[PDB]
Design a binder for this molecule. Structure first.
Ligand code: F38
Ligand code: ZN
Length: 209
């Protein structure tokens, strides 16, 4: 594949800032925990930097294209992605196989500001049948993985709300929450080259006291 994973020390500022983004963007979900489990915080077990020259150059090439189409503004974010295919993504990159075909903004690749939103997809859409070992969507034992990804949004189409093409004249879609005042935005891209899987985070959800 060309992918190397470099472990970050918990003493490293980079580990600490990624962990803080993970922990601080947990929220409660309208499903009461059905899909992703019941928790307020995680036990972070490992954070690895994902290093792949080809995939990075694929990303920066597309980033430049988007920037040049948007007054030299890539509108780059760091966003979470959860998927049963995390280990394929880090080796091969994002592509049409990683799209949410039934997503509310069409068939594209979905990312979240709330880590807990991406956690709902670690075992599949709706949490699937939960962890493979115990069949438990709220498993507190099994190790989960999320990606913290560098994403190029460019000019993003704003959708107020409660693989396809991006809307004409746009590079992405932003799903803005219109009902749940505590929810953060979600984003969709329609080209795998617009995201790079920068950090692989291994964690457990923690049972509340
Ligand atoms: N196509 S598939 O076979 O890879 C199944 C799949 C479906 C949905 C996701 C997914 N949906 C989201 C929706 C909103 C916000 C964040 C996410 C996210 O991180 N992942 C991941 C994988
Ligand atoms: Zn389990």
């Amino acid at each position: 594949s060309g992918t190397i994973l470099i472990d970050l020390s918990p003493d490293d500022k980079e580990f600490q800032s990624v962990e803080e983004e993970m922990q601080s963007t947990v929220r409660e979900h309208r499903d009461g925990g059905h899909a992703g489990g019941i928790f307020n915080r995680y036990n972070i077990l490992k954070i690895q930097k994902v290093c792949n020259k080809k995939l990075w150059e694929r990303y920066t090439h597309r980033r430049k294209e988007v920037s040049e189409e948007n007054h030299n503004h890539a509108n780059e974010r760091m966003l979470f992605h959860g998927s049963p295919f995390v280990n394929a993504i880090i080796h091969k990159g994002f592509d049409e196989r990683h799209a949410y075909i039934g997503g509310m903004f069409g068939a594209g690749i979905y990312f979240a500001e709330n880590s807990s939103k991406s956690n709902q997809y670690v075992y599949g859409i709706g949490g699937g049948t939960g962890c493979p070992v115990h069949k438990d969507r709220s498993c507190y034992i099994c190790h989960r993985q999320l990606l913290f990804c560098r994403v190029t949004l460019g000019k993003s189409f704003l959708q107020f709300s409660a693989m396809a093409h991006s809307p004409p004249g746009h590079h992405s879609v932003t799903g803005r929450p219109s009902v749940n005042g505590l929810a953060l935005a979600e984003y969709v891209i329609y080209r795998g080259e617009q995201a790079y899987p920068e950090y692989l985070i291994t964690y457990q959800i923690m049972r509340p006291e």
